[model samples]
Target: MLIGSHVSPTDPLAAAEAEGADVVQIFLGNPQSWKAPKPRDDAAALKAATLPIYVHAPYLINLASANNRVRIPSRKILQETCAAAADIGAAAVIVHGGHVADDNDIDKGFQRWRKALDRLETEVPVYLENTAGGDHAMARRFDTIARLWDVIGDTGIGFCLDTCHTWAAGEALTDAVDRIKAITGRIDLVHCNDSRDEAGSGRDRHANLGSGQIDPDLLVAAVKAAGAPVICETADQGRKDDIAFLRERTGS
Candidate 1:
């Protein structure tokens, strides 16, 4: 029944406090850059704190890319990201389910994931999150996700379900928890967001709950079904309200 939001990395605990978060997710470095995360001076304090933390990998990662340049670095940064995440005693690291450029190379995409994870060294688990849009995304569609876990499921990785991404990926919100658990055998975390676009729009814009295209009840139901810690990736203006709403509706 933990509820939280994506918060500022500078002062994540304080930011979480402002939003009444019981857990928090943050980027250790520029989310769009390839830069290695700068070591935090407060690492010990954060690790010793009572709050649970999740680290989302940079947005540039495309571990499934056909090209080695993008694919290789994706693995490199992911490893480094995990190390940094452990430094702060993060609960787990959440990364996007990267896409393959060609549809026929989907198996290769999952293979790349296995390779990346097989070589990765971390006590902290890495959870592959469902993405909102990608041409041949490994985790976008349920069938592909089933295929994805078929390859990497043995590596001891985890799964993160995003409600907005599921809606944008054209999956029904009602069965998301059931469908994903059927595939990955686990639901490690819930990115409880509302999408600005329609269910099948393939868009990634996140809106606060009740103000987006997704039914607020559907979001609550999805969160309830997942029965995991929730993180709202909504705007600052209504983030508190969003968390409060989920807390009230889902009893989280």
Candidate 2:
């Protein structure tokens, strides 16, 4: 299993090497902005690096939004980011499972996701990550994820399992990998993080491994079972320790 952490886009290779990572995740541009992605000068160097690269789409992307203003821009940005990721030889682009407005039809939200996928054109895979909050989220709960998957599973879409999000969404860590795979038929990536808040807290706060509310052994066990490229989404400085801890447990 390749172990890594989320790194700065300015110099992802160096950041990954500094953290003893075999892989790295980065944002192609400001994660909060709606701006299109700019080409990276270090694209060749990043592709040449020993570590594998994973691109994370901006946080503002929400294809499930009921408003066209939010949803249309989201589809465009996702496409641009994935195209840029492919240019850098990235393994995949990770994005959150978006939610619809509280008053909108939830089923329409799932349909919106399908429309985005139907129009998306890229060589790089797009991995939809689970979220911590949003009652109308299409991927927060297992049943919702299953519903969303049923629509997009044939499109070759991927799934990203986030430990913190799972626990925050009130899903147990034990057997999570198997259960997720049973639904999606694949586990493309694992965001190995510990939540600062307790299970069912609906919080997205991430704490260092073994220093948070989640059981350390359970975290390791989940990683072992998922057997996918693991990226520590912990805060700065803590990510190195999380990577090391995972390496010690995964022996990779």
Candidate 3:
């Protein structure tokens, strides 16, 4: 298995290499900004040498928001991020499945996402991330994703499984096999992390492997059996340590 870490591309890709990450994840620009920046050739080269590269799209994304103004920018940002990912040789771009809103037209949000994705002609695929367990609003479940797949009706739209989020969202890790069977296809990548908090904590706090509620052995075993690469997405001050902790436990 090819283990990797998320790194800021501001310095050098070798910085990430120095950290023992074969895969590098970076933001194309300031995540909160609507404006997309031009690509840097040096950074691009560094990323290329990094073997596997991934992009986490801007945080301002809200595909299921009720506001049209907000939706437009969200769509544009996603499109631009995808283009930038292609330029930087990213294997995939990870994005959130917007919050569920009753006032917002779910069908409209689906249409907008489809239209935005249609603008991208690159080989880089988009991966939709799951929401926090407490987030009951949008399509947070595998079946909900299935509905989205039906709407997009495209083979390119893939999945990015977030273990912390899934655990928080109350999706039993032991039920992962059933979840995969529910997806009916491949899950491209995973954001692997344990929650220091409890299931349904909804705090989004990530804990070290086996330190939190998730059983490192079971989680790692399930992920390996399913053939998904566990990309460390630990948050807080201990992000690096937590990732290293998981690495030691799972030997990824």
TM-score, per-candidate, Cα-based: 0.98, 0.97, 0.84
lDDT of 1 by residue, 190-229 (tens): 9999999998899999999988999999999888988999
What does the lDDT come to for candidate 3? 0.69
Model 2 TM-score, all chains together: 0.97
Candidate 2 lDDT, 182-236, residue by residue in tens? 9999999999999899999988999889778999899999999999999998888
Measured on C-alpha atoms, candidate 1 has an lDDT of: 0.91
The residue pairs in collision within model 1 are none
Q: Clash pairs of candidate 3?
A: 100-138, 133-169
Following a full C-alpha superposition, what root-mean-square deviation does model 1 have from the true structure?
0.9
Off by over 4 Å in 1: none
Model 3 over residues 1-252: C-alpha lDDT tens digits? 555666675753664556666566778788677887567867557445647888899877886666788877787778778877888778889888886455245566666567666765556888877777544334466666666767765647777777787777767777664575566466678777788888767767776666788878766765665566657765435455655655666567
Residue 209, candidate 3: C-alpha displacement in angstroms:
1.7
Candidate 3, position 147, lDDT? 65
